[PDB]
């Protein structure tokens, strides 16, 4: 489970949660949202030039 804007502090923290996850034999991605914050994905091996 990945909460997008993790609010660690009670007053509020405003940091994203987008770890570089592995891609082994395919993945199943499900998103629950209400204001279209999920915008896509990037795929590759080293994610560089």
């Amino acid at each position, epitope marked *: 489970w990945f909460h997008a804007i993790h609010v660690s502090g009670t007053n509020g923290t405003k940091r994203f949660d987008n770890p570089v996850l592995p891609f082994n034999d395919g993945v199943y991605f499900a998103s629950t949202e209400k204001s*279209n914050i*999920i*915008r*896509g994905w990037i795929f590759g091996t080293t994610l560089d030039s």
Partner: nanobody, 117 residues
Framework: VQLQESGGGLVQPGGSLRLSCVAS???????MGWYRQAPGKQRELVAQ???????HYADSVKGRFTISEHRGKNAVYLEMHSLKPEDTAVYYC?????????????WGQGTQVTVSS
């Protein structure tokens, strides 16, 4: 792949073709539309039909073009009239299948309709 598109044929000026963006099955979309594209020219909008029923027309197409949806056969129908040679183009069927909030139209599979005497 999924959606498969075809229809139409070569005609002469003054004729009318009832082309359809014939689909392959029941589909979900919010604004179905049809494009054109001539060689050396960019794609230009022709008509727009939404789920609600809004019908958007380009400047060069009012007074001659009608759009009707057939939900029984799940296909919109694209009927031209008063055809002129300027309408010859690589006709496209951009779709409104939702994708990350809408997108990924299927206009790549087009039809070839040429208007000439």
């Amino acid at each position: 792949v999924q959606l498969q598109e075809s229809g139409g044929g070569l005609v002469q000026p003054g004729g009318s073709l009832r082309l359809s963006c014939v689909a392959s099955g029941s589909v979900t979309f919010n604004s179905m539309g049809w494009y054109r594209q001539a060689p050396g020219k960019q794609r230009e909008l022709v008509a727009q039909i939404t789920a609600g029923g809004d019908t958007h027309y380009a400047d060069s197409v009012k007074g001659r073009f009608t759009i009707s949806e057939h939900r029984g056969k799940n296909a919109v129908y694209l009927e031209m009239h008063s055809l002129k040679p300027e309408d010859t183009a690589v006709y496209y069927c951009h779709l409104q299948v939702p994708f990350l909030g809408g997108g990924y139209d299927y206009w790549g599979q087009g039809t070839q309709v040429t208007v000439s005497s």
